[model samples]
Target: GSLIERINNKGTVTVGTEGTYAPFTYHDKDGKLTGYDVEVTRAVAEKLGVKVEFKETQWDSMMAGLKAGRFDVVANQVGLTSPERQATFDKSEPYSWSGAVLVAHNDSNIKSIADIKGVKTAQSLTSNYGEKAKAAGAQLVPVDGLAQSLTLIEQKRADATLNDELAVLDYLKKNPNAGVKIVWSAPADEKVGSGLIVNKGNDEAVAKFSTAINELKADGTLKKLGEQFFGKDISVQ
Candidate 1:
């Protein structure tokens, strides 16, 4: 409860964001931060009657900062999937549902999940999607993130990529001429929530943040923000 007092006394809530991941949290030419995740948390800040203190950090350090009491919450649109992560922090009700999908070049013949058979699919070596691609008869091509995945496709180095649908949407939305296209999506059961995170010892803050999220959802702000970023209603699930 006193965690809430610290924010009230300081009159501001601190948040962590990579400020690099776009359509979620990224900076413009003038270095002003703006994105859907930022806006979503901005709405939460207004709901809590608090000013926001946004800190920029790399994704690897984002959780570390929060755990070290450097920030109150992470406004970084982080996905909740692992028991390890859940054990370390409390997550607000999801602002979006992230599910895997198939992405290929617009000119490529791969048009559906079934079409992936025997095709070389680019994916992070350690991501879950890699095994899915292999299990589907698709060969493996190692890449980093969604950006690299698309690059490999565009360069004709790989036939397609399996990745999170929202991430692909963010890329294509931001780069209308990227030449890559999403062709298939994961089944409903494969989807999971993307949430704001609060490290351990911040239960009151997590509870209040969850309240703000529910309120935002009730008022249609969640849907608005979802479509604004992903061009689809990710808030529903």
Candidate 2:
């Protein structure tokens, strides 16, 4: 209640996002904070009749920043399936539905997520993809974000990395000559819901966000933005 009232009085809603996870959130060619998530948050703010102020940070530190009251919500591709997370914070309706994929150097012999056992996987330790890689018995070579993970794979410092399918596709599309290739992807059953997260008990704010997101989804704004970035609608599985 007060959170919403406070922001309403301020005329701006602060959002936390990783400005380095492209296609979802990242800095563009001109160092501008722009991407699907950023734009989506902007649209949500517009619905709330407030301005959006983005605070960029590493993926591993994003939640901590939110818990510290650094921002009103986290607009990154935060997977909403974690019970601990849900219990600690409120989540808006999922805007994107997707899953992870195993990415490796083109020359790598890894053919499946199963084959990652004992393999060195570069990942941001706190991400869902990183957790999935660890569960597959892969050795964790911690990194900051997707770009660094791909770089380590290209340099052969790590054998592979697990990341979102669309993000990897976007990277490969832009860097056609990049030495990495997606070897396997999580099946449909493993798909996760991606959405915005606000502090726990902030039902008013989260409801407003969910309403705005759902409106965007119904109006095709989310689909249009999804296509702009991934060449297809990712608002649905």
Candidate 3:
């Protein structure tokens, strides 16, 4: 009996997440921490016959806490296939796929992948999205977060921005007059996915998370949950 066995014996599985991020996890209007990842963890707990425990912390802090043995597993939309991350923790197989989307001002002429040619893109330097912009024949214009990215677009400093689809969705939904639209969605082959993250050397915990994720994928639980929160299913590979 290792981590998973110990958790079962204790009747509780401790998990970590940033309750500030929405569609994945966030504190609701009622001040209760909840979201898609929370529900997924709940389903995992129910099937494992254990209670779910949460450590609500900021993003990097959550990962640091995980490495320090502060919890059992983390479901904070960590990249499962990233070599840098995998070298430290055993990330479970993807529970949901997310990709770099091409976004532009509604008044812009860019509407699809082909329109990306010769455009200027606003994104952080060394970002995967920056690389995607370059791959699409666009020139890179460095910027910061979502605000700066949209600012560049509005100022015509850049023709577009490459970013996460779900994030763009949430941003637009909250700021309808922001004057931007997601022009294209990259395929899973072109991006990454979300998974359960556990500390390195905890093979038992990693295996348990992997099994639970694969089971959820097979049963369409992740898909249904994705749609409920994101309005589109990114659960399948």
Candidate 4:
């Protein structure tokens, strides 16, 4: 039987997630696991007539856990562009759209993404933005996520970093004096969509989740979720 049927039979869909990516997945001040992706996962499960059970894991271990059947799916904003992951897993239709951008200290000389060549960039090696920084010839100084990456830049330990534009905007809005600014944004053609992911053999699960995601999109729940987190509609490009 397919994973989706099993999930329905069990009355719950177990989801793997980082639970630390702010606005996507994170704990509130009260320490409850809640964020855009977490809530979205719950909404999708509601549409599928099942309950959601989140399995918190680190970002680097997420896909491996999925492959090991540690969870039924991952609702972290996994990018849909990675050919390797696409070949090894089944992805739901994209639920959000955004692009990467180069971030640097306001006083830095870096004027564009191209200026990063030979510069130190704070990055999590497993993230898509890290690969983009490496491809642009930056020397990676490993860090956890957006907060630490920007902190490294503020301390002059790293020259720059690349990250999701919407996330950076949210950070800037919260900390107007963060000492960093977006230096360059990827063009429209370079923007990528993000989606939930399931194990390779769980094609039916992907199909069902995609259908639920589209229904949410059609009914404007996805847009409302995006606005709730980022204060802008990131549900579409």
Candidate 5:
């Protein structure tokens, strides 16, 4: 049987996600991974008459794993940016959208990306924000994860960092005593939506996942999941 046929026969789908990105995908205190992406992936799997088996992958290598057949699909918070869509990968309709926000210590003088000209700014090593920050003439300080970026700012090692608004909000909610503050939020027009990614030539898998995603959106499941994670519906951008 083909891959799709095997999936249909076994009634199981493997999904890849980075567990470090909170509200999107992360492990709770019980060491079980749970988040908006995880829930939505499970819901989609159920809709497709399957059970979801999640595989945790590093953020940088998740796409590679998908291309190499390590999983049927990836549920990591992949942006539906033009460049990514043009790559050798297939993407579902966006399930949620978020913008990069400028975060800084409460006493920092930075207000936006423009203020970081001579100042140090931290961003994820392989994210769009890092490229954008570099384009804006800021001295880029690449970090492995959001937690490390926050640590850099807290220690005054960097003036500010760019992160997803909703993720940053969720982090602050969980860490109220953390000294970092969100200095400003970019408009949604400047944001990007997160989508499910699959292998490039797998049209059957792409169509199956895309149809499931559209059904979820039409039935309001996507919005409900969005609200559950973000406190509002950011599913439709």
Candidate 6:
């Protein structure tokens, strides 16, 4: 009743996201918010027979917005992890997964994680790759975000950086950097992905969105969208 009550009153579901994570959620050339997360949220909204109104929030504060009732659901690609679950955030079934890839200058001798020893590695704060890199004997450098990690590699401040393979591939393709190349991808166990995050009490909306996600996967819409954006099918297993 609460779900229906809100929907009936507002006529739409407000989806929150940080529109700066490229290929996940970002502004397009047309100035419209478009990406895998946006498309997935739109699909779920359509299934629920409600319109979607997107609200852009800063990445660090996006979850706070949802908790504060500024939005009905967080549509950002929040990774599913045990700590997050323990924190009481309800994560929807995964929509995509991508492994971390080690990147280096094209002429660099690094070929695998083993080669990372003694090299400087850049990673986002709190990212899983920080431990992975440290375990490989690389000196880890913490950055604020993906963009900063990439910039560190470009400026020669870091020898390499661990990042999402699909995202790194996309970035290198667009930038055409002669000095950069993906050296290797970590094992699937080390990968991370994006999923919908909702309030713990929003069971109805969660069920509706999860059912819509399953429908998309069953009907091939999820795979089609994955290929369209990532150049390959990356729907989570």
TM-score for each predicted model, relative to the true structure? 0.78, 0.67, 0.78, 0.70, 0.67, 0.72
Off by over 4 Å in 2: 6-10, 100-163, 175-189
Look at candidate 6 and tell me the lDDT of residue 226.
80
Span of 10 residues, lowest total lDDT, candidate 3: 1-10
lDDT of each: 0.82, 0.85, 0.80, 0.85, 0.81, 0.77
Over 1-237, each residue of candidate 2 has an lDDT whose tens digit, in order, gives 366895566587788898887777888898888999999888888877887889888887889888888888998888768787778888888888787888899898888988989999999999887888889899999999999999999999999999888877787777777888889877777888788998888888788788889999999999999888876677876
Candidate 5 to truth, TM: 0.67
lDDT tens per residue, model 4, 126-170: 998899899999999999999999999999999899998788878
Angstrom error of the Cα, residue 218, model 4: value is 2.1
Off by over 4 Å in 3: 7-10, 80-84, 104-112, 120-135, 139-159, 175-181
- Residues 181-204 of candidate 6 have per-residue lDDT tens digits of 777876767767667787777776
lDDT of 3: 0.80
Give the better candidate number (2 or 3) by lDDT.
Answer: 2
- By summed lDDT, the worst window of 10 consecutive residues in model 5 runs over 1-10
lDDT of 1: 0.82
Could you tell me the lDDT of residue 204 within candidate 3? 72
lDDT, residue 105, candidate 2: 92
Residue 131 error, candidate 5, Å: 9.4
RMSD of 4: 5.1
TM-score of model 6 (CA atoms): 0.72
